[PDB]
Amino acid sequence: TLSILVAHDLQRVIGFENQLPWHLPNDLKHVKKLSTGHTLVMGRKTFESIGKPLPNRRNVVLTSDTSFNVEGVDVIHSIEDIYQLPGHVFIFGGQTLFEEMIDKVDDMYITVIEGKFRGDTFFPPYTFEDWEVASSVEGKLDEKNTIPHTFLHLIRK
Ligand SMILES: NC(=O)C1=CN([C@H]2O[C@H](COP(=O)(O)OP(=O)(O)OC[C@H]3O[C@@H](n4cnc5c(N)ncnc54)[C@H](OP(=O)(O)O)[C@@H]3O)[C@@H](O)[C@H]2O)C=CC1
Ligand SMILES: COc1cc([C@H](C)C#Cc2c(C)nc(N)nc2N)ccc1-c1ccccc1
């Protein structure tokens, strides 16, 4: 299976100045649950924004840099390389990789953050005419989770 895994706000913002614009531990738990024991594929900039691979899953970084080498990270140099990765593969970020992959993936796990944040990085536009809502689950508002958010699982029609 090839899936997108993303959190975006009401205007599809996913990032600002190398950071997630919001703080939502519940969504990090969601990521951990979905992707543990599987594979994350991310662009070079997304990886460097996090700085270290996420534990207990395969971390794959897409870059043109032939010297790129990080402990606990597997490197690929082409989009075509993604299709050779075994198991459940999650396209993890960023804007560039999402733009290259949105027309290719089987499904998308999207956390819709019900706010409007300042951003410099965006998920590509998409229409529900193309995507069936397999599930839609409201996140719980919390001491440490104070922004409304909805977990969507979308499957290509
Ligand atoms: N929510 C998120 O996913 C977050 C992501 N970001 C980020 O994304 C922001 C915008 O940059 P964006 O370009 O979207 O980031 P990406 O993570 O998509 O990284 C882009 C880089 O990935 C590599 N890459 C992408 N496609 C190819 C390809 N077809 N062949 C070879 N290499 C490829 C290149 O690396 P190289 O240049 O080394 O060759 C390219 O410059 C950055 O500011 C970064 O912080 C920021 C905050 C949050
Ligand atoms: C390791 O967690 C992160 C992941 C990211 C990348 C960009 C991501 C993502 C992502 C999230 C948070 N949610 C969903 N649903 N999909 C994603 N791809 C960025 C910063 C962080 C981060 C780094 C340090 C502290 C807190 C968060």
CA angle 24, 27, 31 (to 5 degrees): 140
Count of H-run helices and E-run strands, the chain: 3, 10
Backbone dihedral angles phi then psi of residue 120, each to the nearest 5 degrees: -130, 5
Euclidean distance between CA atoms 111 and 149, whole angstroms:
6
Kindly report the number of other CB atoms within 10 A of residue 29's CB atom: 12
The domain segmentation of the chain, as residue ranges, is 1-157
Question: Is the four-CA dihedral 47, 48, 53, 54 of positive or negative sign?
Answer: negative
Provide residues with CB under 6 Å of ligand 1.
Answer: 14-15, 18-20, 42-46, 49, 62-65, 77-79, 93-97, 100, 121
Q: What is the CATH number of domain 1-157?
A: 3.40.430.10
Resolution (A): 1.7
